[PDB]
Amino acid sequence: MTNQYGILFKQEQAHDDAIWSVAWGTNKKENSETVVTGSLDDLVKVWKWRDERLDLQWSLEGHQLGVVSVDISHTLPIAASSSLDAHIRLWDLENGKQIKSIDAGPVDAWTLAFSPDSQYLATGTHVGKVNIFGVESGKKEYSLDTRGKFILSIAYSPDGKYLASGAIDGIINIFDIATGKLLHTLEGHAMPIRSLTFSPDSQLLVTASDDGYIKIYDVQHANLAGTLSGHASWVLNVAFCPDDTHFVSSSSDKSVKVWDVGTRTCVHTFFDHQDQVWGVKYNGNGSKIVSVGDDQEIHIYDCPI
């Protein structure tokens, strides 16, 4: 019996307005399957995947303008969220109690990503800095900087000693986190990036563009070893699966395509999300897919191993 990718769920009104960030954490080995979402309404909602559905755990708040990025930590149960007022919160994930509130000046932080051991929480900056705030202990441990434009999207390598930083002009800079020495700068595109993703066993780096193209690069060089041209309009987010077999992409043309690295073609395409999709993610394995659109819908698709 063929196990085809199935819609398998739709959630009609997750938030009161558009949804912008989704994180899926199989942090707890028990029935946690924590899903966290930020949605421009100054609310961060914690959901759980109980048997076949999402039941809200709680909605927790304190945010001035819309929320821009959320992230969930694998090692410890802990969440982190940044908004438009450059103000970062850390969430307990057991009481919703805001352990710490890292402030920030007018230009410090745009997006977030944890360290594999949940210690550094690298973040972008409107004027090019990639300064790092040590988790739970320190503030502005150091500031790795270049000369350049806005940095929308930031990627972090899984193993370490890599930190990829997209830019508004469309250029990528990769810095090794060990010391901060810029390895080499990739020209990238002539339009913004909005998403950067590495791979598990991180040797391949995939970049999403604002012109609809997707570029595959090899970490050892600046070899543009791939280019994908299926999405009509912009592409906003790209995520992999725990094996280097396929990734999900969520254009701004209301289409989510699941591409494959081996053949670099769209193996399957989904047609939902009446308005444009802003986030996509994978669960603790390759099985399940989460997509969040501008319309207030959470979607969980299936993708057998």
Place this chain on the structure above:
Amino acid sequence: MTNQYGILFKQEQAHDDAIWSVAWGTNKKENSETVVTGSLDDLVKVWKWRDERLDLQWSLEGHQLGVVSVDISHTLPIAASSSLDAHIRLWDLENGKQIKSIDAGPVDAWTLAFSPDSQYLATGTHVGKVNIFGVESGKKEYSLDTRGKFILSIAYSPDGKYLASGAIDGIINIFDIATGKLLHTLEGHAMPIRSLTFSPDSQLLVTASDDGYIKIYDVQHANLAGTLSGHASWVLNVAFCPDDTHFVSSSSDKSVKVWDVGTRTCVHTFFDHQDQVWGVKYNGNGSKIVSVGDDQEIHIYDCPI
């Protein structure tokens, strides 16, 4: 092929906030070299460059808000300052104590300038006029009138008999002090001017508007002799050298350039400030430059004769 330009002194934190104007006066017949600066405070600190450094001498204050213009005199020991405080209190410079106080709001005074014989202290008003007060002799003998807009810059030709006035929207008015009759109104730039200066012997008038250009007009006619464009942001002050060969301009792009009028080119650029540079002046026999900036610092340069 250029001379040896370079810093001599660097005051680390002169005031507690931005420094908005500066005046250098070799007032006494011997080598006194007193530098007076006003800031975003009440502070009007009076420094003295004795041999190799600035040592604070007076810290006099009577103001409530930030000082927008300061001035010094070459004949008497005296100084004047205006602020958003609606007051023109003029100091003594010998015991560090106030001499007088004139009530005048942004409709009666914006920026100061002493007379060639340091006797009248004309200022530029809001409704378009230029008001000429009398130091040590009262208030408001007479006001020249130009049917225009807010007036920002006031300059006196070194020999007297000429007064120039820039305005918001660009137009420039040249009066002759002898009769008080408008000689001619140049149109200059199309946005506010906020700095003007004659040349020694008063045959060359240098403007600096908000768009980056530096017109070089010619007095006794309306001829312009060229446009100096080398900045990348607003131009905030221009000071003309004691010998009629160079002049210094400070821009809002954190850079102090030194031009020469013979070839209309930039000889040397100083890249030493870290924020907007609000004030530049020469000294006596012009061989040093003072540059006060938005960051609290006082640079003194070396332009050998």
Place this chain on the structure above:
Amino acid sequence: MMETERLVLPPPDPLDLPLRAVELGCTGHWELLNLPGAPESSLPHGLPPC
């Protein structure tokens, strides 16, 4: 408008403190002054139209 008058003891207790309520800003932020007098809010006429 029914009573038209009230007589009260102005120094009721010399131990206790009179309450002076000062209002700061449009977003709710109040403080308590010591000396007795009018309520004396800040920005009495509201925010200036910008």
Place this chain on the structure above:
Amino acid sequence: IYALQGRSVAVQKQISKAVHSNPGDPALWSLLSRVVAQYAQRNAKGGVVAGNVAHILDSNHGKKALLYTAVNQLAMGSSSAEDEKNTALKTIQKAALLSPGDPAIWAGLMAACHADDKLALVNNTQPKRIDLYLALLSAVSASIKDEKFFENYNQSLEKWSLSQAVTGLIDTGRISEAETLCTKNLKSNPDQPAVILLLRQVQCKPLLESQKPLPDAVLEELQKTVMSNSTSVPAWQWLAHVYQSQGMMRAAEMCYRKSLQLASQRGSWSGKLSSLLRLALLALKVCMANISNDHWPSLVQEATTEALKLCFCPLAVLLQALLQFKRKMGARETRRLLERVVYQPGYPKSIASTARWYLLRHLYAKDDYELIDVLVNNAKTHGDTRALELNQRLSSQ
């Protein structure tokens, strides 16, 4: 388009969406700051951040972005670390230096000066920056004269500036100058029922500053004058203060209630809390005199409940503490509530000191020396002069 429908929350959300799409474009950030200043001014902190970001990303948008961020800081209050060089006054001053042409910056200067006066008064050190209101008003009028047409907006700006100048003159104490200004203004043009209220306020300041009895003619005149210019909660709250001054409390309560209804119908939010807290203060203070006709505690209860329904007003919880302490002074509930007020953080200094003081009095009533020394060290770990001195004087009578 969204604002036409009166939605008034979607608007800010929509502009935030647009800025998220295109994180550059200083203009977009500046517009977000302006809308937050105008619509939904409860995200003041976000607005301040947005204005600062707009100012950073260029120089030529300095003008409007600095104006909007200064106004947002004004709306915020004094929610800072008492840090120099980043208060409202400094930023509005910076904007005034950038473009001294529009009248909004001058009005912002007026507001910043008044707010600084009030903050210094709170710290109770000195009123400063005393007499500049007349010059700024002249500047505002001169600047407005050269604006082509935003007629309604220009009228609003000039009217607000005039009112603010008169109030400032009243505050500093130069009654005569305010009087001459108002007289000249009314002699200029036919009467408008707003300025006459200002003339009433300036008139009635000497009188009622010293205890005196007033004739019913003036009081009825004042009430009619307030009715002339209705739909303005400030005026009504001031009238209620007048009632308290002479002392007709229930009438003051009614005036506050009318202001509350007016504020609630308008959809405003600050005015409603101001009216509720003021009414609660009136009832509790009148109760302080230990008066009969036990209805004022009920009014205190309802007002405080409404206040907590809206928001997290510390004054409301302290007010409940005082109501409980005064009526049925008691042993346990009052001490527990007072200690709860004075022990969890996130509370203003004055509230903590007052609650600490009353808890100290109750604890001295029911002697327990260990807790008393605990209170003494609590005072020590903060800055206080009054609790410890009173405890020392009355520990050995």
